[PDB]
Amino acid sequence: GEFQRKLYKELVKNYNPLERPVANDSQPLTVYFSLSLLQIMDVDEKNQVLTTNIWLQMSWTDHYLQWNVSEYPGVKTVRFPDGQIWKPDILLYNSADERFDATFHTNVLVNSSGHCQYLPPGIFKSSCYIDVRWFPFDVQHCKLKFGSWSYGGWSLDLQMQEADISGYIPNGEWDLVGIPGKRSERFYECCKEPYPDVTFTVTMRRRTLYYGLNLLIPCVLISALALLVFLLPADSGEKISLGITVLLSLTVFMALVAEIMPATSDSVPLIAQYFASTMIIVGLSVVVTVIVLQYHHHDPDGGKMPKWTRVILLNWCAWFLRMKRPGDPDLAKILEEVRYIANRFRCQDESEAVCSEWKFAACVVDRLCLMAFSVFTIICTIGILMSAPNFVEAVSKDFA
Amino acid sequence: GEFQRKLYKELVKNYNPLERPVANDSQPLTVYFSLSLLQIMDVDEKNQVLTTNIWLQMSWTDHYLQWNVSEYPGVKTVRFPDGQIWKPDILLYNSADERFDATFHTNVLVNSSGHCQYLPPGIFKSSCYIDVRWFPFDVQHCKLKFGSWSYGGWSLDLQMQEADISGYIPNGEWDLVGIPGKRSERFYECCKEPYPDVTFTVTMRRRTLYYGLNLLIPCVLISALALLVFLLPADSGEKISLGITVLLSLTVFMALVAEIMPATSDSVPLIAQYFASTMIIVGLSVVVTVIVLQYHHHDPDGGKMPKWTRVILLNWCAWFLRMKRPGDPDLAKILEEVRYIANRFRCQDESEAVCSEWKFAACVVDRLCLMAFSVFTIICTIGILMSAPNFVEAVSKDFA
Amino acid sequence: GEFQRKLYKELVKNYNPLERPVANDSQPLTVYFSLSLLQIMDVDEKNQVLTTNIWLQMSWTDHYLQWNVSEYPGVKTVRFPDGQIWKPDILLYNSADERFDATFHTNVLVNSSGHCQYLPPGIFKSSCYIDVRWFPFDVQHCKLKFGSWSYGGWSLDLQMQEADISGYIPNGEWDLVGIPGKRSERFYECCKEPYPDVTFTVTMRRRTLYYGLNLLIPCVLISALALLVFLLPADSGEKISLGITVLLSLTVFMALVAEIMPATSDSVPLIAQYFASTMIIVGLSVVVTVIVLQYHHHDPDGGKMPKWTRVILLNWCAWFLRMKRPGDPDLAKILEEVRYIANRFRCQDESEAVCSEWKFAACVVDRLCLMAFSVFTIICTIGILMSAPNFVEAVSKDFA
Amino acid sequence: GEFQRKLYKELVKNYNPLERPVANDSQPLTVYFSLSLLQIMDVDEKNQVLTTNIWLQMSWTDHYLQWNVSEYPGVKTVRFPDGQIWKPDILLYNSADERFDATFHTNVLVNSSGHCQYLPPGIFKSSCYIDVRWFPFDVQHCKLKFGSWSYGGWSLDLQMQEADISGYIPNGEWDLVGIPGKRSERFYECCKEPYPDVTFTVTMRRRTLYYGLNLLIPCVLISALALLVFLLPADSGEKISLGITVLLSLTVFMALVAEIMPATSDSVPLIAQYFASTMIIVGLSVVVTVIVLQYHHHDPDGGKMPKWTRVILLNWCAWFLRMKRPGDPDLAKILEEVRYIANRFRCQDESEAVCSEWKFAACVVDRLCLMAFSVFTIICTIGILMSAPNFVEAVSKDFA
Amino acid sequence: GEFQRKLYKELVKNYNPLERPVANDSQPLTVYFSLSLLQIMDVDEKNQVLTTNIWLQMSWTDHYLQWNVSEYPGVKTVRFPDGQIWKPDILLYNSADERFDATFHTNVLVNSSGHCQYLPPGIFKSSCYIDVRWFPFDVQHCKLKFGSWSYGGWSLDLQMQEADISGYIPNGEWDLVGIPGKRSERFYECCKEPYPDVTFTVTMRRRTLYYGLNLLIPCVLISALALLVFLLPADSGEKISLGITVLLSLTVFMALVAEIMPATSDSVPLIAQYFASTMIIVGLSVVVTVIVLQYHHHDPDGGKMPKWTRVILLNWCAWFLRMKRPGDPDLAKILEEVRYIANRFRCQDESEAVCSEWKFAACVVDRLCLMAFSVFTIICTIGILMSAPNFVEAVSKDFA
């Protein structure tokens, strides 16, 4: 259109894109900054990197891009590309992207009264501190720091508008609690001028259904299966095999799965604590299995039972568990020979009785250890899980 | 040519690439937008990222790029590169690429009557919601949202043309069901102007041949082989080894293959449910194996069976399964000694008979458990698989 | 030089880089397109992406870049950079690179008679269909489609010259069979103008030495050592251990190694078929081992051998395999007592006689199944391998 | 503003961005270079790559960008983008990024007296030598070398200001010791001119809580559990199983975990030394277990022990460990026959006694080797861990 | 300064960056090309990609960039950025980066007599053929080809200066042997003009301390521990378990670690050959263990030993190994009964003697095969290691 073309010709006349568009130079320029979050595309615990897809909202009044709509009847808004009009140098301070600016420079809508608008999208990659102490029931606060790079408080009076999450799409792993913001002024060793900034904190809670179903439940079930080593009769040579195979499976599990955790040293993760507790339980189970096998395979001539252990293990533990406690010269020479045979048989029977008593003591120790270990692992797992905060509310929100 | 050079000289005379080419500024500009899908290169279930090779189709009428062919006899079409003529700022709203615009800016052909065409290719990386509840028999709908970034409904009246899949090449993993689309107008908190957009939904079904062959069949086969623990005679100490080895192999299979699923918590995947069912079956098989070994290795002097279990396990289960149920003074002192030997032998024989009865009870329990577990696992696998919709048609298309 | 500088000044005068350099605008411009394959950098079966390092070759006559060498004695060729002269917009249609154009824009040589040359290099990433049905003995045909983007048949008459592989550096994995090319005209729904293109098909054969040494041989050898379960005497209980451990090793092998295959569903790959056959063989070997152990550990009082199985297993299989088939009152009651002990011993002897017959039957079944499984695995492996085409020629080229 | 626009117009009049802004060309230009470390985002031991978020600080006096504020009442500072004013070509010499320069070119603040300021951020990726001889208790010194690329001592007199870590955020894995630096002049084979540079050395210490908890503790515990093979009674048959399973688990652990060490050959890492010691201990334990099983399973008729091993193993080791040491014609023919039976029984008892003495000797060796191996492993692990320097202080800082 | 600004104004007057700066156009331009290798950042055996950080050195005489220093007292050197003065289009022919030109375009210094200098750095990624036949003791020669892209011999007379490695920082993994180069002229099918090039060959040797310590030693030790299967007494059922577990661990080791070799078929790598030999040794050991178990568990009623094997295994091998070779009517009916009992006992003793002889033969076979296998494995490992060239010098340089 003739009017649009003439207005475009007259609008850039004597216009310098480097100049701050203010009628009075001594007065600061007010820029309203906001944010429009859409997706928490990825959060990387190991690298402490937050990746989001957001739209930055900026607005300011331009003193030179004004016209009377009566003289230009058809046009009411005009769009300027990058590098043709002044734009704020608002940057993400704590950006982790290889190129510092991840915004996609788009056009700039302009009022008929000089008011401007700027909505550059972009995949923002910010470095936020990630806490894994209460993993996976942790609540993460990551901060997005936005502020003008080379404009101070006397020049660009940055202002805050509430973040908009109307277009936000739910993430399958993280539940958003809110995105509050704050505006503050900081001094720098470079210069004697304040540099106001707008910081948006992203509070997200991790959904624990997948992790609880894939890590906690299988490991708890395998630990409960490890207790089966104490129900295997000692006569079958499979207790050691079962215990060591369970331990090998679990030690493969921890190293293979719980490696996505960052190599931080701020504190021990809850999952690490619980894996360590399970490893201790399984190792002590193997130790007790070795002790039980040592008691079971005792030589009758190796040594009699000591009085204290004999009396305690055959009276007190039996009472507690209600275990059942088992239990012419030719004739002369031929008689002597058969007497020898029978005496040897009697000695064999006495040795067998001693061995049976040893086996009973071993089985009693085994049952007592099974009960104690089951109680210990139940209480330890319950306490470890309940130690983390927001555990009950997380379960109520996820499983219920 | 002289005519072509003169027309190029006269075409850009007083031409502003920022101006919307409309004869009447108060009227909007009609832009026909379409899409030409070529390949679904990659869909990332874990990353919720879809990657496709597509060509965007845009066409609009330019009021300033017109000429009389009679005055330029040889030329009929001209091409302008990027940044020399006005082009719609149509962008992919839900882009997941590091740079928002993935299009490759190509030349722009022009009619002799001002009509234009624009066919920029590009590797579009859009973020779509990926549902894995019915994996691998899931049907996925992902939306590609296209619309002008800075032009509203009063300026750029975006229209729609049906997507073209004539050049589409098939994927070896996903079967296209179609690419429908819709045009809608929505408001934004920025401005009081509607912004029409065109959204193309991609409906793709996953081909399940590879997954069913490489995950389902091996796991069902190994679960069926785990039932062999109940056909092993208890006299050989290998039931526990077989069971624990099968369980370890299955837990490695799970934690090694079922990891490409995203860590979502919307719902439990079907494959996760079926792996959990298989894990429960194998664990309970190990528990029953320990029970059978406990029954088999019973001390004769430990205690007789309770009459209830004796009668039930020796009558009812035997009848149901048609089990076969097995079964001077020198002479005086020599007499007493052989009497003692024979009495000891008779006691040994009766103890052996009791032990054999215990072994029979253990074997009968084992067989009953084998039958029950086979029925349970068959019905559970069949039900879990048949629960997912479109299962039968997926099989008919893939295997048949 | 003065002459060179003057010629450069006069050559750009009134030159428009957007104009097609033709004396008669109605006459199409002839562009000779060729390719210079240098390397096959990488071919990605999983992602269906081919990566090559090639030099495109273009040649066309320019009407405006001509001069008389008599007037410029010293200069005979001139080079222009990108964006200063007209260049064909020849693009790789089926490109899979994040940016569509992977070429590196270099200078353009010019004759003293207007003839031009343009050889841009680049790492080209094309989406070619990869067939893994006969993996690893497959022959892959991948197509590189080149053609002008915005120029039709009435404007840019593309012509094909034979591809040059003179500087081709052989790859250590793939053997180049040839790079034939073809030129065709195809229509588009946009426009009523043909768009000639040049398509180069890359026929490469996979060298199978590495794959046959690292995958086929170890799996065959592991199956051969899994057949050893049928040579272990049943009295020693490690048959189940050996069989299950070999099955575990093989199921780890297949999952860990045969994962570079794409998740395609066009057809079952040969390596997948062979792995499935090996899995079936090992699982059936475990089943037969369980059956053999069940026959070996049979209670003598459990039941006599059925007549049919007894006669056939002790006559027909023995004949076939030529197996060896094994085999005052005081005195009165002392008589009665010794008679009792001897009768018990005789019954005992009959008991181990029956047990030895059972063990012989189990061993005969074991040897028969060993022979059957050996012959079956041999014929299955040979047939599966020889089913794929070009097997013999591939072996003759690689190993011989 | 009118004053701002006029000043911008007059400031770039006759200004060449290529010219070094100095009043006297013969005098060098003083540029104060500093650094503002913000985060140690990632260090790559395998790739010898350091990644940090830093802000470079540069300052210099410009003789052409000066004005009298009395003539421009409102403006006091002006900002110039890249490419419009002269900037130092200060580059990171040892950069490991695909593009050599990673700085984000930002605007340039300017005084009212010509003084300048330049604060370009960037994700700096540098190649620093990484020493793993004391892993994970190592202290790393990586050098960042900054200096002008094409300006010498006579032209650009680079000066140094102390690095600022006021805005530094702690890293969860590395504890910063300090960031000292030095300025030096070094010559080049190209040119007879010094090129002063500023080199910042980053001294970081690795926090060892995570590594000590996840690698040292599990491996020490597994090694301690490997000694349980010596407490297993020899009558049971799981000693070899336990030993070989522990060795397999440990080698799987080492292969899967100690792979993020770089493949350097400068020296053997401490973790590699300790893993090798553990592997040697476990292998020698398996050898000792084989020897003990050979001693335990000795045929009585195979031959009596040598007198030397007899006396030593039954006297000296027993004393040291205080182990208990176990321990008408018809009548004639009937006597002869029963005498035969009894003599055979006596010979059997003699052989049994010899075998029991063999078992006692085997158990004595087993206990002695258990004690020796426990002492050896404890001293070896303590010595290896204490060999690394700063071990005590690292433990005190992390665990205490 | 005024002089510097005036010289900058006068230097670019009538200047054309496209023009070759030569006084006589017919005469070629002499460009001195060199290289300053700094670091071998990474070499990719699998990808056949060599990554180095180098500085390119170029120098040429410019006819138009000359001035009299008397007229410009202060300035003596000037710097031009990219695109303002003519630069050689020297490119890396065999590049592998996604963009062909990986150099960073820095400033260009100029003499007071027209002599120029150009030092563009960059991370150069070149495709070099990598030979893994003698891995890890291989010596790699990779070629970096540099030459003018669009300038021939008649125009740009390229000259070579020796590569500079003064600034080289030694790599931990690879030892530099030297970087010699050559200059040659090649003809291309495009043009009838020679195109001289400079090719630098990088001769690098791999330091083998890490690989020898982490692959060769563990596998040799594991094979030596697999040889322990022949010292286990056959009475303990653990030979099969030990052998199969070692084979499983080794087959995990190979497929898990020796995967960074490329899938090349030029020749079998030394490490692959050694792994194949170890696998064959372990499999044959398992076969021999199965044979020994078959001999040990022989039914005495199965059949007598063949005379040949009896005599050879009891005489020749025993002599060679010096193995010890073990070794009124009532009275009548009581006589008959006791005679029966004793006759059965004598038959039992004869059977036991036959079984003991079988056990002796099995043990002798076991010891003989142990000796043979130890000798075979030691000779095979020594020979396969010594086969590779530069083995002794690599050992002397690394371990000594």
Ligand SMILES: CN1CCC[C@H]1c1cccnc1
């Ligand atoms: C607040 N700004 C952003 C970081 C430093 C500071 C600054 C000061 C002067 C010139 N550039 C940047």
Ligand SMILES: CN1CCC[C@H]1c1cccnc1
């Ligand atoms: C519809 N457009 C795209 C997203 C927001 C909106 C918009 C409005 C004004 C200026 N830029 C963008």
Ligand SMILES: CN1CCC[C@H]1c1cccnc1
């Ligand atoms: C041949 N070109 C490449 C693909 C389609 C066709 C085309 C048609 C119109 C405008 N641009 C491209």
Ligand SMILES: CN1CCC[C@H]1c1cccnc1
């Ligand atoms: C100090 N500069 C940076 C590295 C080399 C040196 C240099 C010398 C001459 C021309 N360019 C660079």
